[PDB]
Curated annotation (Swiss-Prot), chain A:
Species whose genome carries this gene: Homo sapiens
Domain of life: Eukaryota
UniProt protein name: DNA-directed RNA polymerase III subunit RPC5
Function: DNA-dependent RNA polymerase catalyzes the transcription of DNA into RNA using the four ribonucleoside triphosphates as substrates. Specific peripheric component of RNA polymerase III (Pol III) which synthesizes small non-coding RNAs including 5S rRNA, snRNAs, tRNAs and miRNAs from at least 500 distinct genomic loci. Assembles with POLR3D/RPC4 forming a subcomplex that binds the Pol III core. Enables recruitment of Pol III at transcription initiation site and drives transcription initiation from both type 2 and type 3 DNA promoters.
Entire protein: shown range: 6 to 51 of 708
Compartments, record wording: Nucleus
Lineage: Eukaryota, Metazoa, Chordata, Craniata, Vertebrata
UniProtKB/Swiss-Prot annotation, chain B:
Recorded superkingdom: Eukaryota
Disease field: Leukodystrophy, hypomyelinating, 8, with or without oligodontia and/or hypogonadotropic hypogonadism: An autosomal recessive neurodegenerative disorder characterized by early childhood onset of cerebellar ataxia and mild intellectual disabilities associated with diffuse hypomyelination apparent on brain MRI. Variable features include oligodontia and/or hypogonadotropic hypogonadism.
Subunit structure: Component of the RNA polymerase III (Pol III) complex consisting of 17 subunits: a ten-subunit catalytic core composed of POLR3A/RPC1, POLR3B/RPC2, POLR1C/RPAC1, POLR1D/RPAC2, POLR3K/RPC10, POLR2E/RPABC1, POLR2F/RPABC2, POLR2H/RPABC3, POLR2K/RPABC4 and POLR2L/RPABC5; a mobile stalk composed of two subunits POLR3H/RPC8 and CRCP/RPC9, protruding from the core and functioning primarily in transcription initiation; and additional subunits homologous to general transcription factors of the RNA polymerase II machinery, POLR3C/RPC3-POLR3F/RPC6-POLR3G/RPC7 heterotrimer required for transcription initiation and POLR3D/RPC4-POLR3E/RPC5 heterodimer involved in both transcription initiation and termination.
Family of the protein in this entry: Belongs to the RNA polymerase beta chain family.
Full-sequence portion shown in this chain: 248 to 294 of 1133
Protein name: DNA-directed RNA polymerase III subunit RPC2
Swiss-Prot record, chain C:
Biological process annotations from GO: defense response to virus; innate immune response; positive regulation of innate immune response; positive regulation of interferon-beta production; tRNA transcription by RNA polymerase III
Entire protein: shown range: 137 to 396 of 398
Modification after translation: Sumoylation on Lys-5 can serve as a signal to mark misfolded Pol III for proteasomal degradation.
Cross-link (Glycyl lysine isopeptide (Lys-Gly) (interchain with G-Cter in SUMO2)): K5, K16, K146
Record carries keyword Membrane: no
UniProt function note: DNA-dependent RNA polymerase catalyzes the transcription of DNA into RNA using the four ribonucleoside triphosphates as substrates. Specific peripheric component of RNA polymerase III (Pol III) which synthesizes small non-coding RNAs including 5S rRNA, snRNAs, tRNAs and miRNAs from at least 500 distinct genomic loci. Assembles with POLR3E/RPC5 forming a subcomplex that binds the Pol III core. Enables recruitment of Pol III at transcription initiation site and drives transcription initiation from both type 2 and type 3 DNA promoters.
Cell compartment(s), UniProt: Nucleus
Name of the protein in its database record: DNA-directed RNA polymerase III subunit RPC4
Keyword Acetylation in record: yes
Keywords: Acetylation, Antiviral defense, DNA-directed RNA polymerase, Immunity, Innate immunity, Isopeptide bond, Methylation, Nucleus, Phosphoprotein, Transcription, Ubl conjugation
Native source organism of the sequence: Homo sapiens (Human)
Family according to the record: Belongs to the eukaryotic RPC4/POLR3D RNA polymerase subunit family.
Source organism, top-level taxon: Eukaryota
GO MF annotations, alphabetized: chromatin binding; DNA binding
Swiss-Prot record, chain D:
Protein name: DNA-directed RNA polymerase III subunit RPC10
Subunit architecture: Component of the RNA polymerase III complex consisting of 17 subunits: a ten-subunit horseshoe-shaped catalytic core composed of POLR3A/RPC1, POLR3B/RPC2, POLR1C/RPAC1, POLR1D/RPAC2, POLR3K/RPC10, POLR2E/RPABC1, POLR2F/RPABC2, POLR2H/RPABC3, POLR2K/RPABC4 and POLR2L/RPABC5; a mobile stalk composed of two subunits POLR3H/RPC8 and CRCP/RPC9, protruding from the core and functioning primarily in transcription initiation; and additional subunits homologous to general transcription factors of the RNA polymerase II machinery, POLR3C/RPC3-POLR3F/RPC6-POLR3G/RPC7 heterotrimer required for transcription initiation and POLR3D/RPC4-POLR3E/RPC5 heterodimer involved in both transcription initiation and termination.
Reported effect, R41W: In HLD21; decrease in expression levels of RNA polymerase III-transcribed genes such as 5S and 7S ribosomal RNAs
Record localization: Nucleus
Residue span relative to the full protein: 1 to 54 of 108
Gene Ontology CC terms, in alphabetical order: cytosol; nucleoplasm; RNA polymerase III complex
GO MF entry, a single one: nucleic acid binding
Organism listed in the record: Homo sapiens
ZnF (C4-type) ranges: 5-28
UniProt-annotated binding residues for Zn(2+) 1: C5, C8, C25, C28
Family as reported in the entry's similarity comment: Belongs to the archaeal RpoM/eukaryotic RPA12/RPB9/RPC11 RNA polymerase family.
Gene, per the UniProt record: POLR3K
Chief localization: nucleus
UniProt keyword Membrane, yes or no: no
Length: 46, 47, 146, 54
């Protein structure tokens, strides 16, 4: 078993290291998204 | 309730067996954490 | 009746209860069908081990944990796909193995919340997350090496 | 079957509105009118023919 193909490279980015968040909806399937739902605002804390 | 059912299970028989619990819960007016905690407190014994 | 707001069935993979009228994949085939069969980019989410096989470069130390926050930009490792479906990650002298994580079916939206100003920021939806990967150290190799 | 509201996720009950039967939640104004036929079969296990003993 040798690496015949798919010798993909891996790079690292630090531009959005402190600005990247992962939001997931456990109750909303992946089929329906909130792209069409108009948003108003979001309250957050550092 | 969707999250609760997903945690319990996604099998047809699982949902069929858990249906009665959801029905008994919906019969009452308990839908929020505050109401559920108030009910639990009312049902709590004195220490 | 609106078609994009129908009732959803419990099974997130078979929410199509009413119509107008999935075998478990592997990482090698996923990458193959993402690169050759199509060319559209895809957002992936991979879980790396706690400590990477490196040292924090001039980070004031100790054998502490070395995460991506200490490494710099540029080429850090390679992704190899051997025969029989083996998918490895050469991140230096050691080689981890990448496997398919829990198949999430619920909505996962990747967003960057940049607080450019102390009073107002910007939330930018970069894309959607569909697949999950897990990278694990090849403990068998690490043990049989020495 | 068991249906849930896409908005909040609570259980949906079948009620009668002003035009047609509909699924509705007890915690939000969300509703869904019934357009075509909807069925939920269970296929209960039938009683097999108990053969003679002996
Ligand atoms: Zn609802």
């Amino acid at each position: 078993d040798d690496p015949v193909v798919q010798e993909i490279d891996v790079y690292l980015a630090k531009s959005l290291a402190e600005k990247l968040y992962l939001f997931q909806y456990p109750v909303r399937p992946a089929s329906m998204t909130y792209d069409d739902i108009p948003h108003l605002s979001a309250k957050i804390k550092p | 309730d969707q999250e609760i059912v997903q945690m319990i299970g996604t099998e047809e028989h699982v949902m069929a067996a858990f249906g009665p619990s959801l029905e008994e819960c919906q019969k009452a007016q308990i839908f929020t954490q505050m109401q559920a905690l108030k009910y639990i407190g009312n049902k709590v014994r004195r220490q | 009746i609106i078609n994009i707001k129908k009732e959803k069935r419990e099974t997130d993979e078979e929410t199509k209860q009413i119509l107008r009228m999935l075998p478990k994949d592997v990482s090698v085939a996923e990458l193959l069908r993402e690169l050759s069969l199509t060319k559209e980019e895809e957002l992936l989410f991979l879980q790396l081990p706690d400590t990477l096989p490196g040292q924090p470069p001039t980070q004031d130390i100790a054998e502490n944990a070395c995460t991506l926050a200490d490494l710099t930009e540029g080429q850090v490792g390679k992704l190899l796909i051997r025969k029989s479906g083996r998918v490895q990650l050469l991140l230096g002298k050691v080689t981890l193995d990448v496997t398919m994580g829990t198949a999430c079916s619920f909505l996962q939206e990747l967003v960057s919340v940049g607080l450019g100003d102390s009073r107002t920021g910007e939330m930018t939806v970069l894309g959607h997350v569909k697949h999950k990967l897990v990278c694990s150290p090849d403990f068998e190799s690490l043990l049989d090496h020495k | 079957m068991l249906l849930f509201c896409p908005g909040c996720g609570n259980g949906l009950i079948v009620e009668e509105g002003q035009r047609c039967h509909r699924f509705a939640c007890n915690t939000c104004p969300y509703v869904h009118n019934i357009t075509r036929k909807v069925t939920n079969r269970k296929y209960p296990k039938l009683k097999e023919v108990d053969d003679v003993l002996g």
